[PDB]
Amino acid sequence: HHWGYGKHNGPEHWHKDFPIAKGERQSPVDIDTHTAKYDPSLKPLSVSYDQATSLRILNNGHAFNVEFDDSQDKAVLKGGPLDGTYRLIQFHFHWGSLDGQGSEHTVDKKKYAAELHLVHWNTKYGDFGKAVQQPDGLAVLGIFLKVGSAKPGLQKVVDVLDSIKTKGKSADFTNFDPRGLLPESLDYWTYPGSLTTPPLLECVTWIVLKEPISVSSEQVLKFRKLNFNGEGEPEELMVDNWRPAQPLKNRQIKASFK
Ligand SMILES: [Zn+2]
């Protein structure tokens, strides 16, 4: 009875194995633009993916992750509200059963078709495993996906999904430049949060971009062909793998714009 997104093992059941699910710094959250606070002291975000080195893409039964080589000071996230440097280790998405839903964070209750999470760990801590044990261990860049024109930089991902349909499958995924998944503007909202999947550790400084990237209906449709199940097991399409908004509980969401 492993955790999942079904009615029997979904978000509403997670607290039984991970009590922190009802904690004080849980993610995602709804971004109420009227209550968010513009902070003029917030510096521009610094995303350096020029030399990021992608390795493989795999279906872990919850989503698909594109992993990178984080052994060198390659892809790093810094600046913005951060006081340290974080290395990119992997990215994945969360999406729905229809274009009307799929994102984890919402803006004034609005849900996007999907949400991209670029995960980075603090260089003060040695590696990912050690970083998640600290309150400022991770910096996750969240980017909303809306339907419209195609996103060229996403095509390589879309095209390879048919080869890793079921849990446990993976494929070579070298030479992928994540710079192709970023919107033009880097304006953002930021707040202290957690991982949105178990163990739900409250070790994340969330940075959610104001500008969503546009992907075509054809592209997002491909996400919905994946399976939660492994090969040979009953079909369980991978859709609605998103955790709903959690109580802000007085944390303050700051923005780099009004
Ligand atoms: Zn995520």
Swiss-Prot record:
Changing residue 3 to A: Impaired activity, not rescued by 4-methylimidazole (4-MI). Changing residue 16 to E: In Jogjakarta. It is an enzyme of class 4 (lyase). Zinc. Can also use cobalt(II) with lower efficiency, but not copper(II), nickel(II) and manganese(II). The keyword Disulfide bond does not apply. The record marks 5, 60, 65 as: Fine-tunes the proton-transfer properties of H-64. It holds the Pfam family Carb_anhydrase. Changing residue 104 to D: Normal CO(2) hydrase activity. GO terms for biological process: angiotensin-activated signaling pathway; carbon dioxide transport; morphogenesis of an epithelium; neuron cellular homeostasis; positive regulation of cellular pH reduction; positive regulation of dipeptide transmembrane transport; positive regulation of synaptic transmission, GABAergic; regulation of chloride transport. Substrate binds at residues 196-197. Optimum pH is 6-8. Its cofactor is Zn(2+); Co(2+). Interacts with SLC4A4. Interaction with SLC4A7 regulates SLC4A7 transporter activity. Interacts with SLC26A6 isoform 4 (via C-terminus cytoplasmic domain). This is Carbonic anhydrase 2. It comes from Homo sapiens. The lineage of its organism: Eukaryota, Metazoa, Chordata, Craniata, Vertebrata. The gene is CA2.
